[PDB]
Amino acid sequence: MELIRIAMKKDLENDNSLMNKWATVAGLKNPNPLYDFLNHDGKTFNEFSSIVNIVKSQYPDREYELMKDYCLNLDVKTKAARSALEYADANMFFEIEDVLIDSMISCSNMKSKEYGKVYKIHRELSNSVITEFEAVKRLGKLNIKTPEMNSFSRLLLLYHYLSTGNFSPMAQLIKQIDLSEISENMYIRNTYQTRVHVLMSNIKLNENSLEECREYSKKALESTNILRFQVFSYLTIGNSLLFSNYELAQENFLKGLSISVQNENYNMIFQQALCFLNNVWRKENKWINFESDSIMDLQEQAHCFINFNENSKAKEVLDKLDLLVHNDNELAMHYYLKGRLEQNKACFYSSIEYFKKSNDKFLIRLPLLELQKMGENQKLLELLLLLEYA
Amino acid sequence: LIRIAMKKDLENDNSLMNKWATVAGLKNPNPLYDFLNHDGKTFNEFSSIVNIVKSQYPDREYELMKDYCLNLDVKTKAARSALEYADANMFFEIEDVLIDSMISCSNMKSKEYGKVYKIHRELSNSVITEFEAVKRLGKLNIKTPEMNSFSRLLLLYHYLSTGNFSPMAQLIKQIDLSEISENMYIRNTYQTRVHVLMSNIKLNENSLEECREYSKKALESTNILRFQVFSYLTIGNSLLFSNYELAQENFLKGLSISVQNENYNMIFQQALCFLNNVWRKENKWINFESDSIMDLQEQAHCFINFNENSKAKEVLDKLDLLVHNDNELAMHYYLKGRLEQNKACFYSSIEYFKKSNDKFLIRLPLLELQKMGENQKLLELLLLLEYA
């Protein structure tokens, strides 16, 4: 017996009223598929949302441990297993996902087959194992037949575009996603829908359309119970306030930390956000990470040093940052900090160039503001704001 | 009238029959006896009688084929060719009459020639918008390949004349003249139009060697004065910023071949006028009794060049009280920028140049910004970011 059902039966010996509470929580309408689930091995709810909501209702502290056991025990060819693979990916439960994947790639069901391979393509692209060109050739070679996977094959390319700083393809790619054509797996449709709101909030942030950003993240929140999406919605809300409302941006980051105390990844993400926030407002920055050699962390070290006129320390940092390799968005930021160290307009224009390449209208405000402080002509600034890169 | 003349010329010397047969590329005088003996009989390619009249009556080409074309049967292939000859020569009196007669006829291929050429001419003279023009063309659901060529030719003409350069490069590449097999006159002249249009596009892209090569090909490909006119114009314009003498030589060549024509004569005068302002030389080509934007801008430019800021301000005052397209506004902001020595005017000038995707004349505000010590990285970025 899987740990989840040992637990809910011993919990039922001691309280009988749980049966109708669990049946409401799972939206089951009558405890009969709940009897079925507890008494017969391999019996599966119809929608994965039922046991997830029970596990979150009754056993939240233990959610990972209980569904790592439930998920790695399901029949991989079933609909629950396919749902489990989406559950795994959305929570960054890569240990449950990679095992589910390398068992669906080999299995006998051609619907779980393709879920497996598409998610494998995703996870190889994420870990820089294959190029963007490999990913799209392997997906095309797959002849995707499910509506779920034609949705997710575009979702995975959006994730890659977002993390590489290649924002200009995203608005067009996301508009082709149509989730209303998923009729089979309502767990996958509800979760994918949450991914889109989160991504759409991301796209509107990089378009400097900040109210629509906050509105999309907020719809994202009201739509989900997955902690990962809540994390990135509070992150996105707070980033949208970076230039306008220090207190409210900080409040959103702290909210994200408070719900993610367990996780070291989520902890560092909000910590890095608070670090950029305090550098932007030129405040004392307790969130610098000095024992790191990632570009994000070294740039925030330079930025703070620059803010406090420690140009030797800043130049040393920017010396290190030179012997490293930047994506476009990262180079924009690099040129911006070089412009503030050396007070050189050409670094700010170089910074504007790469911001234009990556189609980031949000952070391009940092070089634009510095150029105006240097008395740059306002018409030229207008013209910079309106011209685009190829 | 055409054939009265050529047997009056045959009465006096018979050796013209082997000369007229080679010039019209006929291979043997059989279609020329054919043409001369039976009224309404037509050569296979419109290129034959055109090349003849260039041989024998260069003096009289217009009024004898003004007569020849306005007696052709409107439903023939020669008539359709004539409508191109007429269009190729901007003989609007002969084809506007051919046009409103071919839309009325009963033949479905000259049906289509007329109606597209009508859209062209209503688009040219601002009679309909580029919108209406394009929906009227689609409403024809055009089937001949010649007219699928020319329906894009006409919009290119419109983009060229409106200063809307960015649609043109992609529009012209869709043209495929290898699908015209029926009328080789329309394909050879369309061929020259493509060369001429291609020459213009490469000039607006600041690809000046390719520009000159397309114009030189245009010249070797034609005997039509209007395409020669616009080839020397484009060649001379490509040299505006580099080679004063070679630019003036091409304009003067163009002047020499268009001395009778008032339109073309003024075109080269205006090109020579702009050339001398650009090199800031004494400008004998200025037209002081004009109130077109081109002529007044050249007035201001020259005044600015020679430090007559009062005179330049007056001119620029009038030019304010008139209405500019994008490319004209660019030039206005450029000259205001030089008079007021104000960088913002140069960026405004660059803005409207970028809007029109003119990569040639934008060299004017960019050079001024450089003299005023503008940052070179910014100029690079201005050079390479583009408009929506």
Numbering used by the authors:
A (entry chain A): 1 to 390
B (entry chain B): 3 to 390
Text taken from the publication that reported this structure:
The arbitrium system comprises three phage genes: (1) AimP, encoding the peptide that is processed into a 6 aa signaling peptide extracellularly, (2) AimR, encoding the intracellular receptor of AimP that is predicted to be structurally similar to RRNPP regulators, and (3) AimX, encoding a putative long non-coding DNA that functions as the negative regulator of lysogeny. As a transcription factor, AimR dimer induces expression of AimX, which promotes lytic cycle. The concentration of AimP will eventually reach the point that its uptake by newly infected bacteria will be high enough to bind AimR and abolish transcriptional activation of AimX, thereby shifting the phage into lysogenic cycle.
Due to the high flexibility of N-terminus, the electron density of the apo AimR DBD was weak, which made it challenging to build the structure of residues 1–55. After a strenuous effort, the structure of full-length apo AimR was solved at 2.63 Å resolution using single-wavelength anomalous diffraction method. The final structure of apo AimR contained two molecules in the asymmetric unit spanning residues 1–386 and a C-terminal His-tag. A notable feature of AimR structure is that it comprises a total of 24 helical secondary structures, including 22 α-helices and two 310-helices. While the first five helices form the DNA binding domain, the remaining α-helices are grouped into eight TPR motifs and a C-terminal capping helix. The residues L380, L383, L384 and L386 contribute to dimerization by engaging in van der Waals interactions with matching residues from the other subunit. The first three α helices in N-terminal DNA-binding domain of apo AimR show a high degree of flexibility. To conclude, we would like to propose an amended mechanistic model of arbitrium system in SPbeta phages, which takes into consideration all three relevant studies (Dou et al., 2018; Wang et al., 2018, and the present study): in the absence of AimP hexapeptide GMPRGA, AimR possesses a highly flexible N-terminal DNA-binding domain.
